[PDB]
Design a protein around this ligand. Structure first.
Ligand code: FAR
Length: 149
């Protein structure tokens, strides 16, 4: 109940300003999203360029503002393909200063994958469920359906 109240307070002060996917090697922006993907209760959509799938290393840039302080801001992202969990990502940011705006890049450094699922198969069939936490406090759960265009 106090937990519920604190979570809603954080969420009220929180905005995802933008998300970019970048080519980590060149810094080139491959996709820019400006919808607040952190808002719960709606299915958001992202139309990402199919060329993403052949990019050797993709950094995820999130820029977010928070009126509230957070001790351990972090994300859990579960990627579903046709209802079934394909992969899981966990990204910790850490301590967030009250009234701050922060640019956050995340990279999972791994071997590029030469064998991928077709864009035509992925598109519209991928949902990313993101849980926004401060430590163990769940602030928000959003869903984004991916199209590869
Ligand atoms: C290369 C990364 C891909 C295709 C997944 C990108 C993620 C999204 C688009 C949605 C991210 C959602 C939040 C940050 C809430």
């Amino acid at each position: 109940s106090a937990k519920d109240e604190r979570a809603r307070e954080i969420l009220r002060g929180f905005k995802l300003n933008w998300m970019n996917l970048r080519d980590a090697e060149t810094g080139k922006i491959l996709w820019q999203g400006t919808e607040d993907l952190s808002v719960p209760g709606v299915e958001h959509e992202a139309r990402v360029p199919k060329k993403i799938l052949k990019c050797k290393a993709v950094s995820r840039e999130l820029n977010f503002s928070s009126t509230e302080q957070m001790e351990k801001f972090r994300l859990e992202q579960k990627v579903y393909f046709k209802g079934q969990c394909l992969e899981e990502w966990f990204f910790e940011f850490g301590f967030v200063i009250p009234n701050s705006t922060n640019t956050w890049q995340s990279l999972i450094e791994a071997a590029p994958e030469s064998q991928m699922m077709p864009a035509s198969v992925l598109t519209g069939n991928v949902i990313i469920e993101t849980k926004f936490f401060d430590d163990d406090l769940l602030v928000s759960t959003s869903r984004v359906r991916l199209f590869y265009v």
